[PDB]
Subunit: 204 residues, 2 copies
């Protein structure tokens, strides 16, 4: 931890660039995702160390499942293992997404109710088979009964992979979020990417 | 000097003309005196969009929240939005104004434009968010029927004044929008800020 005057209460993480990162190392597109797991657990350890209270990760969307079977199997395998591995740490875990779909991994149904593991030092949410449209229409006030209601306002959204967009992430929680874009692919996560985001957040 | 030849152009551009106050404060003027310097920047962006063939542009006017600003700022920013709409109506715009008309803070002069109106040769659709609120927009539905339903998906959002936030502009229409932040304040608008945004959009 550098010393901070202020931290965001709730950080959202879009872990993008897994496929470009793979392709670049000479692998098949879908082999990138498994290299996204250790960076996830590293971001989480730092959040805990510096005192970030809540983190939401963009797992995958309904649209993402459109992609070829072999990519889908892989980024689903990586989400399961990611939630599995976060469960061995001190995390309050919540998975949000459309469970009324063959595309929601059965192995993650267990974490659709927020669950404390160890001391529960940081709330982790996970968007798995998430759709913005599914989310808003879930209600049909209604804004308090959206599918993503258990996930509060996002102060800071950090997106790896160089693209500046939400890709349909939590349009209610993101209406006022600061947005920091790291050009490096997610699997190239370094602590300094988080410290740079938090340095931007507080100097705002 | 020369107008860049783009491989690919967004069909719908969003503008967040921020920095009017900081701009004035930097010049030693009063906070409120910046807004009047916002109209030529906007008409010039309009004429470039007509030349390059951008079919649609939405401007973020003021939010419901913004009306609680010191009276002298609100008068200035209301008056700029009214000027901006009257002026464009003299230059071949199809104008649509979206905002909470059921409010004393909805400027009466813009009730003429709450249904989309072709003026002259209708060279580009221009939209204006006035007395607008994301919460008001979405709960209007009590999602084809949100207040802002006649404003389509945004391809590219360009914000002046270096803040990296959506500031509640059109949550639904901005879910997949590429976002480009110009650091300079809106009154310092340069054509090259638009070409920089377009070079960015093209490159995705
Ligand atoms: C289409 C044309 C011609 C131009 C429209 C752009 C204009 C005229 C801008 C000024 C009016 C406007 C939309 C104001 C928004 C309302 C508020 C409260 C804005 C906050 O002020 P700011 O963000 O400009 O100032 P700041 O960022 O604090 O320095
Ligand atoms: C939760 C966690 C930390 C896990 C990391 C991996 C993961 C499951 C996230 C990405 C899922 C996905 C469908 C992204 C596709 O783009 P891309 O980013 O893979 O590839 P591209 O940007 O190179 O096209």
């Amino acid at each position: 931890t550098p010393k901070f005057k202020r931290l965001p209460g709730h950080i959202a993480i879009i872990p993008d660039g897994n496929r470009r990162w793979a392709l670049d190392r000479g692998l098949e597109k879908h082999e990138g995702y498994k290299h996204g797991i250790v960076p996830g657990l590293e971001l989480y350890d730092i959040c805990v160390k510096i005192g970030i209270g809540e983190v939401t990760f963009f797992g995958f969307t309904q649209d993402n499942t459109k992609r070829p079977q072999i990519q889908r199997k892989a980024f689903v395998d990586a989400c399961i293992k990611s939630v599995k591995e976060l469960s061995k740490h001190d995390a309050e875990l919540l998975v949000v997404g459309n469970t009324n779909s063959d595309m929601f991994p059965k192995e993650l149904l267990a974490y659709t109710k927020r669950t404390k593991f160890g001391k529960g030092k940081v709330r982790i949410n996970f968007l798995v088979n998430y759709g913005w449209y599914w989310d808003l229409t879930y209600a049909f006030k209604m804004i308090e009964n959206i599918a993503s209601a258990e996930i509060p306002r996002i102060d800071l959204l950090i997106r790896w992979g160089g693209r500046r967009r939400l890709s349909g992430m939590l349009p209610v929680q993101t209406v006022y979020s600061d947005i920091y874009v790291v050009d490096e692919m997610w699997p190239d996560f370094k602590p300094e990417h988080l410290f740079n985001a938090l340095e931007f957040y507080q100097d705002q």
